[PDB]
Amino acid sequence: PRRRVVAAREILPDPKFSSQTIAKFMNHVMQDGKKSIAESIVYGALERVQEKNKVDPVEFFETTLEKVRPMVEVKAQVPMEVRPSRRTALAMRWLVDAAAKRSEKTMALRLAGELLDAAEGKGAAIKKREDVHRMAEANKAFS
Amino acid sequence: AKKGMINRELKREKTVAKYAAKRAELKATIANVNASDEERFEAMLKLQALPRNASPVRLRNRCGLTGRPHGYFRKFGLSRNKLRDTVMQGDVPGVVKASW
């Protein structure tokens, strides 16, 4: 805004696992206020991955989001360093967008699939991160 | 409105008032079961024979001060143009400007 700065909107942690990151991803997944269906999808994916490979769901999700998180951006065109909140937001948006275009029937198992793909290193979100890195390198000199 | 239209309305109202009783009796006879189908048919035929302005379906609500046929507001018997003025002059008991 022109005048003054608005404080960040506090988001209550996820009741089950007490993770603000999980709550933020859940809200990213939500559509039309259907929080119950979003919760079902996210908890189901976390439980599936935990059962498949024995790892703490919160730790694994944080580690994967770290890999998928970007590093640089360009603003209208001059490169700039992304802020921590925008980093996480872009990462989660990229994961959900790539899942939207994935070819599997459902969304929860199809989200777990992309989580494993990103953990391995090959995925649409990682490709988009590499593309933004390339474009930032191309416009590096400015600023 | 036009004075001819107002008088048409008044004439239709008078006709309805005149024929109210017989039309109701005929409807009851039509709807009666114990009576024979012959009597019910004759009642229906007479009902159809009643003059058209006897039917209340043809009455149109009109303002009451100007005869306007649109925006009637049954509760006040007045169209919006006069209702706004009468309310804002303080001549309609209990009516104020609403805010919530």
Binding site: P15, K16, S36, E39 | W100
Partner: protein
């Protein structure tokens, strides 16, 4: 033995709290019967879980009004006030946890000339 009232989005809850072993009843139904989500149950359980006194008291509750989330929030608020009445010294902990504050958010009214509270009609650009 102690009482509290809770309010959230047109919902009102009456909470009776007494020394007990951990029984909880809402409108003559168990928590899992009354609420179908896990989030509602966790919201109901937050205050005693924080106080580490879940199995210390018995809860008899009636509620009416609003929806499921509102009813859960009202129950939490009522339980919080009942616990404060039982022991005022819990008030700092509960106020830190944010259970003391009564949420005053409510639905904004529809406005003349608008589809909703703030959504306008579409405006053709010439």
């Amino acid at each position: 033995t102690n009482y509290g009232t809770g309010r959230r989005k047109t919902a009102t809850a009456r909470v009776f709290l007494s020394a007990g072993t951990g029984k909880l009843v809402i409108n003559n139904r168990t928590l899992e019967q009354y609420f179908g989500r896990e989030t509602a149950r966790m919201v109901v359980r937050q205050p005693l879980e924080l106080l580490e006194a879940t199995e210390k008291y018995d809860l008899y509750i009636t509620v009416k009004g609003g929806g499921i989330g509102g009813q859960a929030g009202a129950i939490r608020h009522g339980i919080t006030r009942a616990l404060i009445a039982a022991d005022e010294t819990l008030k700092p902990v509960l106020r830190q946890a944010g259970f003391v504050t009564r949420d005053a958010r409510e639905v904004e009214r529809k406005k003349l000339g608008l589809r909703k509270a703030r959504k306008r009609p579409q405006f053709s650009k010439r």
